[PDB]
């Protein structure tokens, strides 16, 4: 029932929808939207579970 409310359908369209929430007002690109999702939880330097 959550997949009905999802406006995205693929991966690159979904990475834009995180950019429009995290950095709103700035138009997103391909390589700028890919590096933002990686830098949230999947980088050693900007995430630590300790």
């Amino acid at each position: 029932e959550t997949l009905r409310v999802d406006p995205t359908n693929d991966r690159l369209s979904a990475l834009v929808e995180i950019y429009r929430m995290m950095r709103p007002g700035e138009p997103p690109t391909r390589e700028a939207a890919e590096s933002l999702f990686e830098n949230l939880f999947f980088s050693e330097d900007r995430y630590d579970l300790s």
Partner: peptide, 25 residues
């Protein structure tokens, strides 16, 4: 054609209020 991509953004913005975003745009 890099100005029609702003009209794809400007009517659909997340209402930015930071002037550094508006200048770098």
């Amino acid at each position: 054609a890099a100005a029609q991509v702003l009209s794809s953004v400007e009517s659909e913005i997340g209402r930015t209020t930071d002037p550094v975003r508006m200048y770098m745009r």
